[PDB]
């Protein structure tokens, strides 16, 4: 099942990093196996309501705690392929006082790297990039 | 079922890009087939409560993670047909310090492209366009 | 059932546009027919829990994605009949830097149109109109 | 049942406008009748789970769409009887740049009307009045 | 049951106003009686699921509509006994442009009354008092 | 059960005030006894669904109303033991216009007390302390 | 089970502090044991619905109260391994007026420590670090 999940993630391009892809495949396989085991246990007569409630509460806690990380990952997934964000392109992010200017040097799944005029490295989150005005020369 | 979903999406005009329409049709067909299979499994006696809980948690996670993308897509769907946003039209978006000025050159399902006086390309999200004051000369 | 829903919407005045009224009547009729069919299927013994869960998840996704559109529509519904917002009336919306001034020329279910001193057309969303201070000369 | 709901609303003073009171009484009577009918249908054996789910989804959509209207109505209900907000009283609402000054001339369930020094009519929502500093001379 | 609820509220000090205490006691007694009646009806065989769903939806609507009022009441409950907020004490609430200065003259369950240097009466909500920096001379 | 809850709270250090600890122990004992009684009542055949729904709605209302108080209490619990916040230590909280400067004199479970240069007493909520930049000389 | 949870946490690197790891292992073991006991009790016939509802309400209260702490912990987990945040590295966090400048001296699971030009110690929460522009020389 891990191989199937890895192939699915690689084909759809959701995850490109081999380590992250392997970790996500393992997590998904474990979750599916646990769901199948819980269904089988509930079929024969075992009351699975407390287990379902505990699993749901734990999952909700994990999801709500990692909201920023998930949003940044989804923003990186969506922003992939954008023509304005390319290596060597001078872009400006934000409007007003909260403005960021630099040249794109490297792209990551959590941060967007820009090089300022003075040479400083700017780490702009993909979430900030999605919901902001992007100015490209 | 994929053909039916594609025809539905094309007729209602929700999705116009053939690739996005095909992907959405495949996703919808898979979801409907999974729901039907789960209902059939639960009819004969298999306890489908853990499977339903896991599917609901995963769906909630996916929906909450892609909130910005979904909002931008819905904003693009709603804003289609607006007379103020047309090619060659000089429009101004925002009020106060957070203001954006340019001429509409191209429209997308995620970004709105404007050409500044200096020639810079401005990428204004459709979500920003919906909930802001639009000034058209 | 579509005729009944159309008559209901026309009588209560929720929707005045014939196209929007027809679309909403069709959507409501389809939803009611689906609910009745699901209830009938569940009566004879078919496990409708997965179908109910999938329908609820899809409905929640659609509602959360169209939150801004629904809020604007409700704001337009509520603001109808206001004496301050009439054709030819000079009104001012907002306080401080985020201020909008103009004369009302046309009203829509999504935008409020104002004419500035220079002749620019201002598109103020009804949601912005509801939760803001309105100044009328 | 409509008469009972109207008498209840009039006695508790929640709604004072006869038209709004009649509409709310009709809505409440319809909702109670529908709930009773659904309970009776479910008693004899009809599976009412899909109907309950659809009704809950529709109610949640309506509640979330009318959030601003409901909040303003509740704010008007709470603010009734306040000594600072009386006809002919010069009051100031807000702090800093977002400040509003005028004399109270008329009170409504959606807006608070103030007369400026120049004679302009200010429409301050009751929600803005509740969560703001009120200065009364 | 109304007497028991009134005694409970008086002993715990949650509500001190006799009118508010009586209204809350009546509401609580009605809610408990309704819950007991619904449980008794469901025991003999009546399907109480639609009634439970309708009651839950109505309660959620009422709670969400009165969020500001409930928050202000809880803030007043918590802030009671604070040494900095006493009659005749000169206090300052807020930081930066959004600042409020005055002497405490009277305390209420919804507003905090301050007397300015010029003699104006300031109505600061208890919610604003809780989540702000308080400066006491 | 009250003694057990008091010992648990004292050992884990969640609550240090004897009055608050006693009140929380009483509340927890009452809640556990009510849950056990409801389970016993539902075992013999009594339909406990309306009671569970009413208890859940009341608990959700209480939790949502006391959100600020709970957040401040958790912030005080987390911030305990911090080396920067000690008696006699000159600390600065906030960035930009919303800045607070003073020397720590006393610590509470709801407020943080600072002494300004002029001698004024500053009441900074623990929630404000947690999510802000702290500058310590 | 405590040993298994401790080994799991140590291997995945979620928690590195031995005290926090031991506390989390104890909490997880207690939760799993309680869920298993509740399932066993519900299997033999005991109505576990009130217990499940009470446990879910308590868990939701605890999760919502510790939202900031959980978010900071997840931010610290995610930010681990970042090259820009290293000892002796001069970094700048924030844009506009809300800006923070200093050299990284020590890293914690709740705060990020920076040394200013004057020698002051700055405590920047990891949540603030994640959702902000980071400037590294």
PDB file of C-alpha atoms in Angstrom, chain C residues 35 38-39 42-43 52 63 67 74 78 82 84 95 127 129-137, chain D residues 46-47 49-51 53 61 64-66 68-69 98 100 110-111 113 120-123 125 128:
ATOM      1  CA  UNK C  35     -33.348  14.187  -0.258  1.00  0.00           C
ATOM      2  CA  UNK C  38     -32.328   9.189  -0.280  1.00  0.00           C
ATOM      3  CA  UNK C  39     -35.027   8.891   2.389  1.00  0.00           C
ATOM      4  CA  UNK C  42     -32.949   4.342   3.365  1.00  0.00           C
ATOM      5  CA  UNK C  43     -36.479   3.271   4.287  1.00  0.00           C
ATOM      6  CA  UNK C  52     -25.373  11.482   3.604  1.00  0.00           C
ATOM      7  CA  UNK C  63     -21.026  26.850   1.215  1.00  0.00           C
ATOM      8  CA  UNK C  67     -19.088  32.601   1.576  1.00  0.00           C
ATOM      9  CA  UNK C  74     -27.682  38.738   1.760  1.00  0.00           C
ATOM     10  CA  UNK C  78     -31.155  43.529   3.438  1.00  0.00           C
ATOM     11  CA  UNK C  82     -32.916  52.015   2.161  1.00  0.00           C
ATOM     12  CA  UNK C  84     -30.114  56.881   1.848  1.00  0.00           C
ATOM     13  CA  UNK C  95     -14.327  56.405   7.769  1.00  0.00           C
ATOM     14  CA  UNK C 127     -20.994  43.755   2.260  1.00  0.00           C
ATOM     15  CA  UNK C 129     -21.878  49.027   2.581  1.00  0.00           C
ATOM     16  CA  UNK C 130     -23.595  47.110   5.393  1.00  0.00           C
ATOM     17  CA  UNK C 131     -20.711  47.149   7.893  1.00  0.00           C
ATOM     18  CA  UNK C 132     -19.591  50.754   7.430  1.00  0.00           C
ATOM     19  CA  UNK C 133     -20.657  54.278   8.310  1.00  0.00           C
ATOM     20  CA  UNK C 134     -22.786  55.798   5.540  1.00  0.00           C
ATOM     21  CA  UNK C 135     -22.801  59.592   5.203  1.00  0.00           C
ATOM     22  CA  UNK C 136     -25.645  61.099   3.168  1.00  0.00           C
ATOM     23  CA  UNK C 137     -25.910  64.816   2.420  1.00  0.00           C
TER      24      UNK C 137
ATOM     25  CA  UNK D  46     -39.558   6.346   7.457  1.00  0.00           C
ATOM     26  CA  UNK D  47     -35.818   7.038   7.464  1.00  0.00           C
ATOM     27  CA  UNK D  49     -31.824  10.999   8.360  1.00  0.00           C
ATOM     28  CA  UNK D  50     -31.378  12.445   4.821  1.00  0.00           C
ATOM     29  CA  UNK D  51     -34.158  14.971   5.436  1.00  0.00           C
ATOM     30  CA  UNK D  53     -29.184  16.353   7.135  1.00  0.00           C
ATOM     31  CA  UNK D  61     -26.182  28.064   5.164  1.00  0.00           C
ATOM     32  CA  UNK D  64     -23.978  31.805   8.127  1.00  0.00           C
ATOM     33  CA  UNK D  65     -25.175  33.977   5.234  1.00  0.00           C
ATOM     34  CA  UNK D  66     -27.232  36.271   7.509  1.00  0.00           C
ATOM     35  CA  UNK D  68     -24.198  40.332   9.897  1.00  0.00           C
ATOM     36  CA  UNK D  69     -27.963  40.910   9.883  1.00  0.00           C
ATOM     37  CA  UNK D  98     -12.174  55.950  12.847  1.00  0.00           C
ATOM     38  CA  UNK D 100     -17.956  59.443  14.292  1.00  0.00           C
ATOM     39  CA  UNK D 110     -30.331  48.197  11.671  1.00  0.00           C
ATOM     40  CA  UNK D 111     -28.817  51.695  11.775  1.00  0.00           C
ATOM     41  CA  UNK D 113     -28.850  57.959  12.776  1.00  0.00           C
ATOM     42  CA  UNK D 120     -25.074  65.233   7.027  1.00  0.00           C
ATOM     43  CA  UNK D 121     -26.912  62.097   8.143  1.00  0.00           C
ATOM     44  CA  UNK D 122     -24.655  59.367   9.547  1.00  0.00           C
ATOM     45  CA  UNK D 123     -25.741  55.713   9.510  1.00  0.00           C
ATOM     46  CA  UNK D 125     -24.635  50.114  12.499  1.00  0.00           C
ATOM     47  CA  UNK D 128     -20.359  49.147  15.432  1.00  0.00           C
TER      48      UNK D 128
END
